[PDB]
């Protein structure tokens, strides 16, 4: 990919301040004339087979276009060099949005942010692209309008074992219980359904302005997270509403295949207060 | 607190040997070998002569809670008993904070263990009874649990002394670095798994899980075949699934006296509340036993794996 494959017309793309880091290399800042998120990446594997994949996924991205996706705009790969450019989100993410003392959350706001990201991975997954990231950290509220980041990044194979906490929340019991050393993320069983479960923690966020496990060791969170017994006892532990736990019931459904589309999510979230 | 007179004569020494070097920063030290990771290396202090164990980890997070850490761990200074190596200093110095302590001749019990093969019963009475001691120590004298307790993190030396390593004295490191990772084996109680309220009662599991390693040289869950009893590839979840829904390992009943089976079979009740606590275990007959006898333990440490 040299850049000039995309529908964005491309001169000359600026590097600015990096802006944070995390597993999936450094996000900088940068100026398409707009700012836009340009993240460095680098194959490790070198290995033909994996840009091939790689090739593929950057060229469906390509086919993507949603008011609540973010907008993927081009990806260039002078291997083991990568670098993924989508636009830039001005405003807040959610997960530091919920945890402001100042924001004012309400049983209307919750349902209509919820709403916009059901949008979203309604789109994405009509388009058979599975997030596998969906997180608080992952969908900017700017406003009213609010757009979902870094979908299918984790199907990258790029450059013991340490596990964040605030992942794990979003991780359905499927994905952890096969989480092993040795064993990379891009093996782990990530669906639509262990994306509807992710939005079951987005959603208890929404309500809680917290992680629905207090900061535990990994270890404590993967046994309680793929028992299914976590879940189950956070649900019972504070209640906020029996229409609002109903959904938050559903999508941390233990059983995957019991876990609702996110079609059939907006309907219900639709039948609220 | 049953303070001996050569313990509290060997205190004494490495008090005030501990301000004869001061303190410190990074160019004081010079590295010399690989002691492991989990990382520690063998250094050497050029003020003071003195060869230390100093373990770094690489920590790049926000300045601010880098200084509620090390203000948090300063407090070190303030634990010294003859069951816990020898503190030094802590200090951040290029995005590695470094902890200075005691070097121990023998190394972890891991190390020990690997080499020995197996460890005797007359020679872990003595380990547990200064892990007892170390942790109604750390409980009574400060306040705290250990919530770290591993054969890799009990560490000996040629001295003859006995004393633990790694112990969390940091609630904000805990929630920040240490909960992150997870290996290939789980010391942790089955209480804190399931993630209710834990107190010292985990750490007396995690100490009767490590003295089953020890005694047989092989990480005891899942529990071995009958066969490969005689002679002496598992995702991270099983492990913990059968710690928590699984009967807890147990010695073998054919090598092994009542006293030390009972001892263990104490401490690996899965109800913290009928586990036994420090005080139950340091009247156990096992302790009674251990603490009377006469073992010499700088002689079977450099005799096994080659140190004088
Ligand atoms: N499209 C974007 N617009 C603005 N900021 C972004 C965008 N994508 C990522 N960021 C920011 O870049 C930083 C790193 O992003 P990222 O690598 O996705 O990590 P994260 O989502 O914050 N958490 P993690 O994925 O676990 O490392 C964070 O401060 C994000 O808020
Ligand atoms: N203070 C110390 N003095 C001497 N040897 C030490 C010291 N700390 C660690 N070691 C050695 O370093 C190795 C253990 O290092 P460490 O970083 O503590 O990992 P670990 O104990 O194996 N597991 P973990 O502590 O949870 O990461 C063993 O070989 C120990 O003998
Ligand atoms: C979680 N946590 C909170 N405080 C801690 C602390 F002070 C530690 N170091 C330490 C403490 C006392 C003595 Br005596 C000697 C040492 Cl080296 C460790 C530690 O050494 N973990 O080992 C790495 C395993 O990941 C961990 C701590």
């Known amino acids: ?273 | 607190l049953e303070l001996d007179e050569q313990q509290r004569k060997r205190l004494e020494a490495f008090l005030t040997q501990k301000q004869k070097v001061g303190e410190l920063k990074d160019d004081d030290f010079e590295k010399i070998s690989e002691l492991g990771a989990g990382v520690v290396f063998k250094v050497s202090h050029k003020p003071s002569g003195l060869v230390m164990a100093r373990k770094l980890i690489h920590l790049e997070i926000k300045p601010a809670i880098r200084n509620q850490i090390i203000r948090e761990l300063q407090v070190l200074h303030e634990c010294n008993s003859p069951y816990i190596v020898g503190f030094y200093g802590a200090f951040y110095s290029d995005g590695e904070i470094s902890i200075c302590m005691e070097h121990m001749d023998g190394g972890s019990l891991d190390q020990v263990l690997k080499k020995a093969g197996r460890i005797p019963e007359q020679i872990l009475g003595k380990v547990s009874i200064a892990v007892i001691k170390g942790l109604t120590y750390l409980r009574e004298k400060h306040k705290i649990m250990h919530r770290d307790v591993k054969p890799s993190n009990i560490l000996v030396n040629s001295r003859g002394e006995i004393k633990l390593c790694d112990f969390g004295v940091s609630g904000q490191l805990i929630d920040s670095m240490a909960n992150s990772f997870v290996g290939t084996r789980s010391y942790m109680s089955p209480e804190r798994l399931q993630g209710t309220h834990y107190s010292v009662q985990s750490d007396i599991w995690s100490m009767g899980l490590s003295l089953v390693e020890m005694a047989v040289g092989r990480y005891p869950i899942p529990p071995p075949d009958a066969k490969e009893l005689e002679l002496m590839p598992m995702a991270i979840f099983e492990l913990l699934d059968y710690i928590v829904n699984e009967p807890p390992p147990k010695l073998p009943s054919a090598v092994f006296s009542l006293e030390f089976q009972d001892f263990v079979n104490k401490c690996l009740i899965k109800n913290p509340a009928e586990r036994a606590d420090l005080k139950q275990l340091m009247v156990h007959a096992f302790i009674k036993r251990s603490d009377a006898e006469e073992v010499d333990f700088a002689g079977w440490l450099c005799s096994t794996i080659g140190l004088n």
């Open chain 1, 1 to 273: 990919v040299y850049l000039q494959e995309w529908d964005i017309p491309f001169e000359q793309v600026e590097l600015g301040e990096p802006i944070g880091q995390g597993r999936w290399g450094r996000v900088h800042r940068g100026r398409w004339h707009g700012e836009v998120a340009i993240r460095l990446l680098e194959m490790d594997g070198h290995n033909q087979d994996h840009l091939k994949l790689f090739k593929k996924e950057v060229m469906n991205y390509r086919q993507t276009r949603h008011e609540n996706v973010v907008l993927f705009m081009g990806a260039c790969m002078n291997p083991p060099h990568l670098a993924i450019i989508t636009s830039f989100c001005k405003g807040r993410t959610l997960h530091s949005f919920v945890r402001d003392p100042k924001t004012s959350l309400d049983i209307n706001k919750t349902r209509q942010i919820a709403q916009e990201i059901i949008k979203g991975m309604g789109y994405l997954h009509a388009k058979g692209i599975v997030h596998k990231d969906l997180k608080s950290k992952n969908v900017f509220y700017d406003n009213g309008k609010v757009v979902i980041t870094d979908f299918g990044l984790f199907g990258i194979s790029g450059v013991q074992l340490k596990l964040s906490h605030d992942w794990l929340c979003y991780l359905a019991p499927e994905i952890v219980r096969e989480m092993t050393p040795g064993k990379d993320e891009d093996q782990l069983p990530f669906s639509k359904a262990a994306d509807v479960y992710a939005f079951g923690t987005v959603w208890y966020e929404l309500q809680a302005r917290d992680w629905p496990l207090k900061n535990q060791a990994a270890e404590a969170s993967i046994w309680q997270i793929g028992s299914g017994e976590g879940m189950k006892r956070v649900l019972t532990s504070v209640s906020l509403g029996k229409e609002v736990s109903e959904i938050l019931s559903a999508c941390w459904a233990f059983d995957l295949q019991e876990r609702p589309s996110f079609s059939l999510l907006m309907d219900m979230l639709e039948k609220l207060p």
